[PDB]
Ligand binder design. Structure first.
Ligand SMILES: Nc1ncnc2c1ncn2[C@@H]1O[C@H](COP(=O)(O)OP(=O)(O)O)[C@@H](O)[C@H]1O
Ligand SMILES: Nc1ncnc2c1ncn2[C@@H]1O[C@H](COP(=O)(O)OP(=O)(O)O)[C@@H](O)[C@H]1O
Ligand SMILES: *Cc1c(O)c(OC)cc2c(C)c(CCOCCOC)c(=O)oc12
Ligand SMILES: *Cc1c(O)c(OC)cc2c(C)c(CCOCCOC)c(=O)oc12
Ligand SMILES: [Mg+2]
Ligand SMILES: [Mg+2]
Lengths: 388, 383
């Protein structure tokens, strides 16, 4: 009637449905040792479990962003999987007007997703089906902190994977991390714009994925974060799979950087450029985009107090990017000995100081990161770039 | 080396921090739940058992902390209260605190409504401050909350250097309200005191020196806060607003509530003459807030589209208000280009305007008091 289903260890009352999956799949709320879990029952005729991959996940350290499959058991006609019981899917996070994000903010969230995914790829495993619904939010712990974990991995298909809208194009063989990095890109933009898809509406989505149409209409060219984000997503959702950035690669990116990390970068650059010829390849590179970034003369687009105190020292070109970079490194390093007025059109440090400049020079950070490869090694830049 | 005095019991070692005048506060146990207990010298503070009983005979308030029980030993007094996680001090000051969680405005709303609970019963706090405002522990499912504390006791001058109302040096609800203002600015400024450093604080309070240096005038929200804060902390006791009076203020309004007002006005002003006091009043500050002509300070599609009708001035606040009430009420029929520069609604649509007209909301709220008593405006105003 409405009697409980065992197939122990797993157990669940069949009225406790959490939601339907694709091909006659269903997910209920159940029980395990005695802790709650969610049990998902897949028709062995529709989906194919990859037990070896998981046996591989267990015998390698746990990642806090890749969900745990507790056990699995078979009844005569069904496959039952017990997994960490979660509270919601990205979908609600983004789209539920009143969802209570709690602690975590979109960028950390994406940092978590991408980190977990990177771990999966570290074990030569490809998810093949990322999307808001396969990226889940934990319930709150004792300390109340909530996190995010990717799911429904290693759970393939028999008699094409993925979901209309999120399918890397080149899948229309044995896939490769490039696919998942496409799906990632989409979710990234989905989260940031607060619901919009880059491709960009249910019905046209896959068609437009095939054609290569993007939108990205939310990313303006005058905002620092919009620029740094677009620079990445545009590259993740790239039509050419061999252009899509590696997993860890996406993790070093400027996009995730603290304000402190940002400003710290800005400086660390400057300290190289002194004692480097301007005819030189490095500075010539840093000045290629030049004027556009600096708005012709950067002195004309900052505060009057700051141009006065700078004035008192000259040796700041103003159409020059490098001079804008040391100008920062100095106004910063001598910060304590500054006039007060000047201390307060910026300040304090690092957050307000950096934001001053990136607010005025949206293309600054992006441009500077892109310029300052060539120092992929240096022994020192390994914190901002990846050398391998 | 455990200490009983049941039903309260605590380890003397589990200390949570020293309070005033010799007070010490430990982590103990009550029924079998964890609690905080504080031991006071009966000789230095005076508990008020009548006040607490009264609060206890009354419906709980979620933002006013609970006293479970109290017990005297030969030489001390011990008090058992809900065990909280930290004070407003840490919330503001601790670079990595995990907030987690909850926004400053609802935080101050919470503190205020509790306060108003206290004043509902004719009971005044007298020593409000960050250290006397606590953050609950994460609950069953991870939501944090803020409650006031250390009330109902006294001293055998009340308050703390930095937070005492001016007239208490040389009481009524006005005193708390001042301390409240102080905290509001402390919290919004992320650390700064209005008066505004430990030593010059009380002095300056007597003198009247403020700062509010963090409130620009070009930001809708700063203008809103400042306009209220400055009034909480006002030198004159008769000027400081009622407790729940402060709960009705725009400072706490949702985007949607802000917008609903904007509109709820236009629908009032319309179909009345300009000789009428109301309109003439609304344009008192006029040109400056609309920026001479607001038509020149809005987005391009929107003027292009608002060209097609006007009949719209640009030196008229009422015409900018009407504008919002039309462009919103027809949002559906707008040209997509236009629908896209604002929207969705209410949030993005109301910020379109308040981003560019910082004094717009403030200005209108003031002018429109004239209709304080009307059925439609009680949700916005106080009596
Ligand atoms: N760990 C979980 N906790 C709660 N609900 C879940 C969990 N995992 C999956 N679900 C629910 O089941 C629905 C569909 O199941 P499934 O086939 O696993 O995913 P999808 O919808 O991604 O294809 C999901 O949208 C989700 O609401
Ligand atoms: N309910 C409580 N839970 C946990 N700690 C508390 C509680 N009440 C007070 N404290 C701690 O006690 C310390 C001071 O004791 P108290 O009597 O409040 O003096 P003060 O008024 O300076 O806070 C505070 O710093 C706070 O950490
Ligand atoms: C603004 C500024 C710049 O740009 C700079 O460039 C190297 C240096 C300094 C220094 C060293 C100080 C410290 C005070 O030195 C004063 C003596 O100068 C004649 C500063 O305040 O600002 C800069
Ligand atoms: C923008 C706008 C304004 O300002 C306005 O003020 C009177 C009215 C309208 C209306 C009525 C509509 C609906 C479309 O009407 C076109 C003419 O037919 C009545 C609108 O889209 O925008 C405004
Ligand atoms: Mg799923
Ligand atoms: Mg206290």
């Amino acid at each position: 009637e409405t009697r409980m289903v065992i197939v122990g260890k797993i157990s669940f009352c069949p009225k406790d449905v959490l939601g339907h999956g694709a091909e006659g799949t269903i997910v209920y709320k159940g029980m395990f040792d005695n802790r709650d879990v969610a049990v998902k029952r897949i028709l062995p005729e529709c989906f194919s479990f990859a037990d070896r991959e998981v046996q591989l996940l267990r015998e390698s350290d746990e990642h806090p962003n890749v969900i745990r499959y507790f056990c699995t058991e078979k009844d005569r006609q069904f496959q039952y999987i017990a997994i960490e019981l979660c509270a919601a899917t990205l979908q609600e996070y983004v789209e539920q007007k009143d969802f209570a994000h709690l602690g975590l903010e979109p960028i950390t969230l994406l940092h978590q997703t991408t980190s977990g995914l990177a771990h999966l790829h570290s074990l030569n495993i490809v998810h093949r089906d990322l999307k808001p619904h396969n990226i889940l939010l934990s319930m709150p712990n004792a300390h109340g902190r909530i996190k995010a974990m990717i799911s429904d991995f290693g759970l393939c298909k028999k008699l094409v994977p993925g979901t209309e809208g999120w399918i890397a194009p080149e899948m229309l063989d044995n896939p490769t991390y490039t696919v998942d990095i496409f799906s990632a890109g989409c979710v990234f933009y989905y989260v940031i714009s607060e619901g919009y898809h880059p491709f960009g509406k249910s019905l046209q989505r896959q068609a437009n994925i095939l054609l290569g149409a993007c939108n990205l209409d939310c990313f303006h060219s005058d905002k620092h974060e919009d620029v740094i984000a677009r620079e990445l997503i545009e590259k993740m959702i790239a039509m050419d799979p061999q252009q899509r950035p590696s997993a860890k690669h996406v993790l070093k990116h400027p996009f995730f950087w603290s304000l402190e990390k940002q400003l710290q970068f800005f400086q660390d650059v400057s300290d190289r450029i002194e004692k480097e010829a301007l005819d030189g390849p490095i500075v010539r590179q840093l000045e290629r985009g030049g004027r556009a970034v600096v708005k012709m003369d950067w002195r004309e687009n900052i505060t009057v107090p700051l141009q006065t105190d700078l004035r008192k020292f000259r040796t700041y070109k103003g159409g020059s990017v490098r001079d804008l970079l040391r100008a920062m490194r100095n106004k910063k390093h001598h910060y304590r000995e500054l006039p007060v007025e000047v201390q307060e059109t910026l300040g304090s440090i690092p957050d307000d100081f950096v934001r001053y400049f990136t607010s005025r020079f949206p293309h600054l950070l992006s441009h500077t990161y892109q310029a300052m490869e060539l120092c992929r090694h240096e022994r020192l830049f390994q914190t901002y770039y990846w050398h391998e």
